[PDB]
Amino acid sequence: VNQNAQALNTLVKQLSSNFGAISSVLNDILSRLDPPEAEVQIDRLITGR
Amino acid sequence: YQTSNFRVQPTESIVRFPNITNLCPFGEVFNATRFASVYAWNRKRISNCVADYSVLYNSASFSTFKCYGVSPTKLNDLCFTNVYADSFVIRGDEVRQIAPGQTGNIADYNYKLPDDFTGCVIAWNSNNLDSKVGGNYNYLYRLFRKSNLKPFERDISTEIYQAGSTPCNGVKGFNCYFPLQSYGFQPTYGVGYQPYRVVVLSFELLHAPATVCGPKKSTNLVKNKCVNFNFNGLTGTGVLTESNKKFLPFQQFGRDIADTTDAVRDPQTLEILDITPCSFGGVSVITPGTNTSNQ
Amino acid sequence: QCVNFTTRTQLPPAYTNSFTRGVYYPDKVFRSSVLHSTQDLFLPFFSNVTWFHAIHKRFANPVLPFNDGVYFASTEKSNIIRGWIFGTTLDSKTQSLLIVNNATNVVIKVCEFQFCNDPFLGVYYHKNNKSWMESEFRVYSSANNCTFEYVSQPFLMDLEGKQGNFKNLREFVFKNIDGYFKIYSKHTPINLVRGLPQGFSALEPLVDLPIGINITRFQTLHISSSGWTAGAAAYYVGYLQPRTFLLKYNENGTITDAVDCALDPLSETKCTLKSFTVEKGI
């Protein structure tokens, strides 16, 4: 049970990691940068997750 | 077999921001009785304030306004580090001389806009106030100068301009004229010579945080339903329900063991709601073989 | 005014010990019955901080850097200290900051200040209707080019004479993060003869100030030349460091325990296992 707990917990904690982007939350990214400049950081985040 | 996944879509969006109350008197230069000279223009320092541009623009209570680089309806969700207000009185024919990258009588020698200027220009008809019987000589303007002023430069100094080379000292000689002249304001003249109050809004953007921004609109609160919620700090989707949790006075939102936000406090009023994401799951199909039946 | 005090002697920075001091709420997030570990500018446990006091021929006001962050601890009955002097050049050349309590509320001003050689405060002509209100401000003569102003929440102060043990503890943490000046405050009653009491307490945020000016040094206001003596007061000055604490949240959100990770070899295991109880093993 603890290894499963650590695995589910790890899978949830990876959403909080920044993964090289400006922020881990996608709504501030879509609300600030233009779509062509924005697509490079969102692809870096999807590929990281 | 699992053929798909289902999710409940949100009915609407809810956006609530904290109160804008205890506003600063940003309209002091707008409602001011008398300004200074075009070369004497005063700059209002606005810091740690919130300015409402809706009653300044959408109400259409003024004569005219003109924007540069940004729409007047986009100023609510956008803002920069600092905001200034330059109050001065000019004539009707000099209204067109106020613009970035443009040259003119008062543009080069009095007040000049930078090429990157993102702000706006606001004007209204002052003829019912600034005009009086016999003329108002209180306001002055610099007609002649030997050089051009830098953008956003204020020089109130007085002198005697010399067109040619003459030893003019304290007198008016040949090729020696007074650089400062008085307006000819009279109520009987047409709209071209009527005095207009032009207050230009100067925006400044630096590495410092932005302490001055536009108004913040809020919406109604709905409970026990799946909605898209944004309260001032974050975006998220879930079902809002009042709970028994207790927050400390400085705590805006809170998170669970997964570092996901399970609760948020209203930035406007005082209420504590748990955040439960909307229900979803997989679609399971119970069917016999194709050769048995279609149920 | 120009000449200094005859009894002025700069003391060396002697050290004393602190136990649980430096624990504070890193953010406004509310978590309950969990152990969270964060990395920010912190005050290490069991460290050495300066031990300073001033009486009616011992006078100490050294100059210390505010660079890595500075902790303030003041144990006083009547809350004598109104505020501190903050700034880079500490004069009108650059912007300086002053947090001053006027006994009504907390006053914050950022301006260009002309520095006087001998600042001080006091009350004059109290014979009729005393009230112990501030009369004249002699600390700074002039102020100009003010880029910022703020007034904080109302607080309560009673300067009436009291008897017995020290009734108050003021624990302050001042810091600069990306221009935000974060003011942390905690106030609790204690029974203390001398030194520091045994106990654990968390420091609560007051205000987050978005000024964004650089401050390389700080000073303490002188509040009470041979016949003018200082009052009885004591203060402590710590230094924040990028440490890591393991915070223990109770059911109400208050921190009941803290473990400094790199302090002790057992505590690196406490932060590794993410628990306040270490099980037997390697």
Side-chain angles (χ1 to χ4, degrees):
Chain A
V1 282
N2 312 351
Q3 36 214 7
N4 220 55
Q6 276 328 323
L8 45 68
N9 265 342
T10 299
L11 243 197
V12 294
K13 292 324 176 178
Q14 294 296 101
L15 295 303
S16 64
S17 178
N18 162 13
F19 279 81
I22 295 171
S23 178
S24 63
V25 69
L26 293 172
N27 331 93
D28 54 346
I29 296 307
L30 296 175
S31 64
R32 293 182 182 175
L33 295 175
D34 202 344
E37 293 74 351
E39 296 173 71
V40 54
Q41 296 51 40
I42 35 173
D43 313 315
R44 297 178 212 171
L45 160 48
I46 36 169
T47 300
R49 291 182 181 174
Chain B
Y1 296 146
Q2 184 175 354
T3 59
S4 178
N5 292 282
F6 144 88
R7 74 188 26 223
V8 46
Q9 295 300 321
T11 300
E12 62 299 26
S13 296
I14 165 169
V15 175
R16 292 177 64 86
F17 291 159
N19 288 336
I20 61 172
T21 59
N22 193 30
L23 293 172
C24 297
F26 59 89
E28 275 330 286
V29 296
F30 295 156
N31 291 337
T33 299
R34 299 289 182 268
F35 295 163
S37 295
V38 62
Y39 62 93
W41 58 272
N42 292 336
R43 181 182 64 196
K44 183 180 172 62
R45 185 59 211 109
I46 296 171
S47 178
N48 258 30
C49 293
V50 175
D52 186 5
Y53 297 139
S54 296
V55 297
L56 298 177
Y57 296 139
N58 291 336
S59 65
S61 64
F62 295 158
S63 296
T64 188
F65 58 90
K66 187 177 181 180
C67 56
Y68 295 136
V70 63
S71 91
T73 59
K74 206 35 179 177
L75 296 175
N76 291 337
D77 291 344
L78 296 175
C79 49
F80 292 157
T81 300
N82 291 284
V83 175
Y84 296 142
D86 293 344
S87 63
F88 57 89
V89 176
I90 60 172
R91 293 173 296 181
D93 290 344
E94 294 177 351
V95 175
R96 294 182 182 175
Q97 293 178 335
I98 300 300
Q102 294 300 321
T103 59
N105 290 337
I106 62 171
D108 291 344
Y109 299 142
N110 288 283
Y111 178 77
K112 183 178 179 180
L113 276 67
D115 291 344
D116 59 353
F117 177 78
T118 59
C120 297
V121 176
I122 295 171
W124 60 90
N125 192 341
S126 64
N127 191 30
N128 290 336
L129 296 175
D130 291 344
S131 295
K132 63 181 179 181
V133 176
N136 190 30
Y137 296 140
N138 291 337
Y139 298 142
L140 276 68
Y141 67 97
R142 185 182 296 275
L143 179 63
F144 293 159
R145 186 176 179 83
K146 294 177 179 178
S147 178
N148 291 336
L149 293 175
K150 294 177 179 177
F152 295 158
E153 183 179 2
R154 180 182 64 195
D155 187 4
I156 60 172
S157 63
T158 60
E159 62 184 343
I160 295 171
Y161 177 78
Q162 295 178 156
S165 178
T166 302
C168 294
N169 190 340
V171 295
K172 183 178 179 180
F174 179 79
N175 288 338
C176 295
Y177 296 139
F178 294 160
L180 296 175
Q181 295 299 321
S182 296
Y183 288 134
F185 293 159
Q186 187 173 355
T188 60
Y189 294 142
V191 296
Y193 296 140
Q194 290 178 336
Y196 295 140
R197 293 181 182 174
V198 176
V199 176
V200 176
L201 296 175
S202 178
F203 295 159
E204 184 179 3
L205 177 63
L206 296 175
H207 60 284
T211 60
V212 175
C213 295
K216 301 300 182 181
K217 294 177 179 177
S218 296
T219 59
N220 192 341
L221 176 61
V222 75
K223 326 272 211 303
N224 224 327
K225 205 176 57 49
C226 181
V227 293
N228 287 356
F229 61 88
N230 184 339
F231 298 158
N232 191 30
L234 58 83
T235 288
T237 82
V239 52
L240 296 175
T241 299
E242 298 324 306
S243 63
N244 290 337
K245 295 180 177 174
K246 179 281 197 181
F247 275 40
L248 296 174
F250 62 111
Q251 295 172 331
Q252 295 300 321
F253 58 94
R255 292 174 206 121
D256 89 8
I257 48 183
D259 314 345
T260 52
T261 299
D262 88 3
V264 63
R265 184 182 66 194
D266 187 5
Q268 185 173 355
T269 60
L270 296 175
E271 70 265 40
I272 178 47
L273 279 68
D274 38 2
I275 293 170
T276 299
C278 300
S279 80
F280 59 92
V283 200
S284 296
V285 61
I286 275 283
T287 186
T290 301
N291 85 14
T292 42
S293 178
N294 249 14
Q295 290 306 59
Chain C
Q1 294 178 336
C2 296
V3 296
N4 57 33
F5 294 160
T6 59
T7 59
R8 179 177 181 171
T9 299
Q10 186 173 355
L11 296 174
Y15 323 145
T16 187
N17 290 283
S18 64
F19 296 160
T20 59
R21 291 305 101 71
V23 47
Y24 62 90
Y25 296 136
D27 191 4
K28 296 176 179 178
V29 157
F30 177 77
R31 340 177 176 86
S32 211
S33 324
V34 297
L35 297 174
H36 183 181
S37 178
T38 47
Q39 187 44 33
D40 153 31
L41 296 175
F42 286 6
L43 177 62
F45 294 0
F46 295 41
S47 63
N48 290 283
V49 289
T50 59
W51 183 84
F52 292 157
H53 64 80
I55 60 173
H56 294 82
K57 294 177 179 177
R58 294 182 182 175
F59 179 82
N61 189 210
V63 177
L64 297 94
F66 144 78
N67 190 30
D68 58 353
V70 176
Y71 177 115
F72 199 84
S74 178
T75 180
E76 292 174 349
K77 290 180 294 297
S78 63
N79 291 336
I80 295 170
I81 293 171
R82 298 176 180 276
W84 297 263
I85 293 171
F86 295 156
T88 299
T89 59
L90 296 175
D91 59 10
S92 63
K93 183 45 179 180
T94 58
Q95 295 299 321
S96 295
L97 178 174
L98 293 293
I99 295 171
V100 175
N101 189 340
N102 64 346
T104 299
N105 56 33
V106 176
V107 176
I108 316 304
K109 295 323 145 179
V110 176
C111 301
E112 293 179 351
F113 307 100
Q114 184 63 59
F115 178 79
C116 296
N117 290 337
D118 186 6
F120 59 95
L121 295 174
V123 60
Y124 295 139
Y125 296 140
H126 61 284
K127 183 178 179 180
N128 290 283
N129 291 336
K130 296 176 179 177
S131 296
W132 293 98
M133 57 66 101
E134 183 178 2
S135 178
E136 294 178 351
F137 178 80
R138 297 295 181 190
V139 174
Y140 253 114
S141 63
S142 63
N144 56 33
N145 192 30
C146 298
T147 59
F148 181 84
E149 183 178 2
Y150 177 112
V151 175
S152 178
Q153 294 300 321
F155 292 159
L156 296 175
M157 319 294 128
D158 187 4
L159 296 177
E160 184 178 2
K162 294 176 179 177
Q163 295 300 321
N165 291 336
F166 296 159
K167 294 176 179 177
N168 290 283
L169 229 54
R170 300 328 212 186
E171 296 176 350
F172 296 166
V173 174
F174 301 155
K175 60 185 294 180
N176 188 342
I177 301 300
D178 162 23
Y180 295 139
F181 186 110
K182 294 176 179 177
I183 290 172
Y184 299 137
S185 63
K186 179 61 174 172
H187 301 324
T188 185
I190 60 171
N191 47 340
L192 177 64
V193 176
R194 65 182 181 88
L196 291 173
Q198 186 174 355
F200 180 81
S201 64
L203 290 59
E204 174 30 59
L206 177 62
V207 75
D208 186 4
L209 205 31
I211 297 170
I213 60 172
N214 291 336
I215 294 170
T216 59
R217 288 175 295 297
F218 100 101
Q219 294 315 147
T220 301
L221 292 174
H222 333 96
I223 296 166
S224 62
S225 296
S226 64
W228 181 257
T229 59
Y235 66 110
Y236 298 171
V237 157
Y239 294 57
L240 293 73
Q241 295 300 321
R243 300 287 293 173
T244 300
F245 293 143
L246 177 63
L247 298 71
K248 182 178 179 180
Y249 296 139
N250 65 346
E251 90 295 338
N252 290 336
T254 301
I255 294 172
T256 59
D257 166 39
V259 175
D260 171 330
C261 296
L263 154 63
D264 173 310
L266 169 153
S267 64
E268 291 117 345
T269 89
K270 294 254 179 92
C271 296
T272 299
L273 293 62
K274 205 55 189 228
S275 178
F276 101 96
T277 299
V278 175
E279 189 40 53
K280 183 178 107 42
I282 181 50

